[PDB]
Amino acid sequence: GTILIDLSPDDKEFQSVEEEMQSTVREHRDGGHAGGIFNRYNILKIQKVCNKKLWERYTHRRKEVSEENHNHANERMLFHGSPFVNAIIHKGFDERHAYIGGMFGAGIYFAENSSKSNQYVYGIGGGTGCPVHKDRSCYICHRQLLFCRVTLGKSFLQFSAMAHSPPGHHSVTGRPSVNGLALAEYVIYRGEQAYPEYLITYQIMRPE
Numbered sequence: 001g002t003i004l005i006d007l008s009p010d011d012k013e014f015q016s017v018e019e020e021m022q023s024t025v026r027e028h029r030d031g032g033h034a035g036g037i038f039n040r041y042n043i044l045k046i047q048k049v050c051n052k053k054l055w056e057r058y059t060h061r062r063k064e065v066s067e068e069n070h071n072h073a074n075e076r077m078l079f080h081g082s083p084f085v086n087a088i089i090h091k092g093f094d095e096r097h098a099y100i101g102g103m104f105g106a107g108i109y110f111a112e113n114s115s116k117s118n119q120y121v122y123g124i125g126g127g128t129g130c131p132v133h134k135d136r137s138c139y140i141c142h143r144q145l146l147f148c149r150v151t152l153g154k155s156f157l158q159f160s161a162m163a164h165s166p167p168g169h170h171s172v173t174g175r176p177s178v179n180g181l182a183l184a185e186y187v188i189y190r191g192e193q194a195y196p197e198y199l200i201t202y203q204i205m206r207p208e
């Protein structure tokens, strides 16, 4: 039941999603090993992901969380990078999309920094890079990220450099405690707490 609707570059919605993508690029501690060397992207396409059943699954769970947290879903828009982006947009997030080895346990991880999610497009640590050239810094091959609506509810705060949520919480927030420029990362433990709203197709750009 998934349909993908292309947004025009003239559409304010295209422009606001592009800006979130470009404006949350940072430098990574690996010097670009996992995700490549770049300061900005070439955005090729932004599509709205439309699935009624997956949307209703999300909103149902959002209302449950909200009623357990003084009517506050604590909903954010966050990036997700994965080799399984085609399955996510068709069947939703579920326990097959869980980072078993994540630092906050086996859940589904999201980032405020688009460049953080970019490191996972070709797999954990960037895998072996693009399928065509085996290059984690490929500037030719088209990459995809999801920009997702995520219900955090009561989030457990972890200060730091499928499982269950900590008791009494709906998610975990990984707060950076060393790299002053890094934005937060987040984990949910139920697929129904995220909806993949935008599919973004891009290339990373070689710095001049």
Ligand SMILES: CN1CCN(c2nc3c(c(=O)[nH]2)CCCC3)CC1
Pocket (backbone or CB within 6 Å): 079, 080, 081, 082, 083, 097, 098, 099, 109, 110, 111, 116, 117, 118, 120, 123, 124, 185, 186
């Ligand atoms: C194969 N899995 C795909 C998604 N994945 C993933 N992890 C993270 C992020 C992400 O976008 N995808 C952003 C925060 C850091 C962790 C874990 C590995």
Ligand SMILES: [Zn+2]
Pocket (backbone or CB within 6 Å): 130, 131, 132, 133, 134, 135, 138, 139, 140, 141
């Ligand atoms: Zn390539």
